[PDB]
Write a protein that binds this ligand. Structure first.
Ligand SMILES: [Mg+2]
Length: 469
RNA sequence: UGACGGCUCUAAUCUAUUAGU
DNA sequence: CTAATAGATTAGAGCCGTCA
């Protein structure tokens, strides 16, 4: 017989200085942190896409209701929540004719057709940003569904074009990094989900009972990409810098090699949260070696410490390096010789590989979300997915898998590590959910690494997330 | 790519030992 | 260097479900 400890919910902060565990209820009752005046939208696409986008904007102005209110809270309309204006009147439209899309998607080569389509879509945006006077906050791209199915890694149709990955989204986001334009990509079937059907008279994707969830998610993404702040973490310890490292293989560049990208989070003076990336891949020619050479790791730590010191004035007292791999002595000894003496380096490995499952005896639901099984002083299991009493349901299906936390380097208290990891799961601005399954320091550093490796080398890429997600 | 979760098919790398070079 | 047996790790792709 073993013992399980339970970890309390972290709580997040909204307007008026109010707290709550659910983002939706906090946004509905108190509203966002900062105050935008309005969002001016630029749309690029066909006439069908423009009509669909205008219809969705008109649709999401009124209150929207879900089938089960307890599980998913209602959507009370955009302006009731966000206290700003985003209507179908600040739209500036740049038409893309259907002939171009038809004729470019004919070469039968994925690389050439993807490059041509991306260039066609981005040249108009570049021109409208350079040679025009109108102001656009977030650009909205509305791609037809018939090009989405063909621009994928493994896709077959039923000149510096080979240096890029054959995916529309990654290349599109990468090639606009040097102009710093926020963008949101939509599929025609995502907004006009009724009109696209199958052999039966039903939509392929049925949003009849989860329409409020889609409205919440789209509104939150559009409000974040316009330079807004919808919530923040209530309790973050001072003097603690959280880092996150992810390795992505740079496919098809003269050899099989792989890079590394990071993310960082801390609390700055003024009770603000600085959640921002750490960019510029650090490589190593070895194939399958998910590690860093000393020269490439000293630079990474120096960069992170310099950033924190520049924003704060003093070095961090504690630095936690979360990762999904295991460090070695060769690279960890590269650490600790650029780190000062008044700073604690803790390297924590997070994985979801070990197959443990817990079942309730004489019941029908799953285990709580706070439960943790402490194996040792350097090892534990934490359930980040499970039954949440507030929404009266679980965050997954079947029986969820635990997250295996293992203190790899340094010394730390495993309970505090679990508390910080659980608190790091409430900052998913790409989503409007109760909580996420893994820390976002490992997810946003993965999105940035996925975008950065689908283009040629670009000097000093932006750090802000709004240009990536 | 509006999110998230759960599965499946695949490919490397390392360590140990053996063997033709 | 090449070719097999294992254990213990890693990163990629692709498909399905979300309510009652
Ligand atoms: Mg997004």
């Amino acid at each position: 017989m073993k013992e399980l400890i339970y970890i309390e919910e972290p709580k997040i902060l909204f307007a008026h200085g109010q707290k709550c565990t659910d983002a939706r209820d906090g946004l509905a009752l108190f509203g966002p942190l900062n105050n935008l005046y309005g969002i001016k939208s630029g749309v690029i696409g066909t006439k069908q896409g423009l009509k669909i986008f205008r219809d969705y904007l008109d649709h999401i102005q009124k209150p929207i209701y879900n089938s089960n209110s307890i599980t998913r809270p209602m959507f009370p309309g955009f302006e009731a929540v966000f206290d700003c204006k985003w209507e179908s009147t600040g739209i500036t439209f740049k038409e893309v004719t259907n002939e171009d899309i038809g004729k470019f998607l004919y070469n039968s080569s994925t690389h050439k057709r993807t490059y041509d389509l991306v260039s066609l879509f981005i040249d108009k945006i570049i021109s409208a940003n350079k040679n025009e006077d109108e102001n656009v906050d977030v650009w909205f791209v509305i791609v037809p569904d018939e090009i989405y199915k063909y621009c994928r890694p493994n896709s077959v149709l039923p000149a510096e074009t080979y240096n890029y990955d054959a995916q529309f989204h990654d290349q599109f986001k990468a090639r606009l990094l040097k102009h710093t334009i926020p963008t949101q990509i939509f599929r025609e079937s995502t907004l006009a989900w009724r009109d696209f059907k199958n052999a039966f008279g039903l939509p392929i994707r049925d949003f009849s009972k989860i329409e409020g969830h889609l409205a919440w998610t789209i509104s939150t993404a559009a409000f974040y990409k316009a330079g807004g702040k919808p919530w923040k973490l209530s309790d973050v310890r001072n003097g603690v810098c959280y880092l996150g490292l992810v390795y992505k293989k740079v496919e098809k560049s003269k050899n099989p090699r792989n890079a590394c990208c990071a993310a960082q989070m801390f609390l700055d003076n003024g009770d603000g949260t600085v959640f921002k990336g750490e960019v510029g891949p650090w490589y190593n020619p070895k194939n399958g070696q998910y590690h860093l050479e000393p020269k490439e790791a000293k630079a990474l730590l120096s960069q992170s410490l310099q950033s924190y010191k520049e924003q704060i004035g003093e070095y961090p007292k504690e630095v936690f390096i979360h990762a999904k791999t295991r460090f070695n002595h060769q690279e960890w000894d590269a650490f600790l010789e650029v780190t000062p003496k008044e700073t604690n380096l803790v390297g924590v490995t997070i994985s979801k590989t070990k197959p443990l499952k817990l079942y309730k005896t004489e019941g029908d639901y799953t285990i709580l979300r706070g439960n943790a099984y402490v194996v040792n002083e350097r090892s534990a299991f934490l359930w980040t997915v499970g039954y949440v009493p507030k929404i009266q349901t679980a965050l997954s299906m079947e029986v969820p898998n635990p997250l295996f936390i293992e203190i790899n380097k340094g010394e730390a208290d495993i309970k505090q590590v679990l508390k910080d990891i659980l608190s790091l799961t409430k900052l998913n601005y790409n989503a409007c959910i109760f909580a996420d399954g893994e820390p976002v320091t490992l997810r946003f550093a993965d999105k940035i690494g996925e975008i950065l490796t689908a283009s040629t080398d670009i000097k000093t890429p932006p750090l802000a997330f709004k240009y990536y997600i």
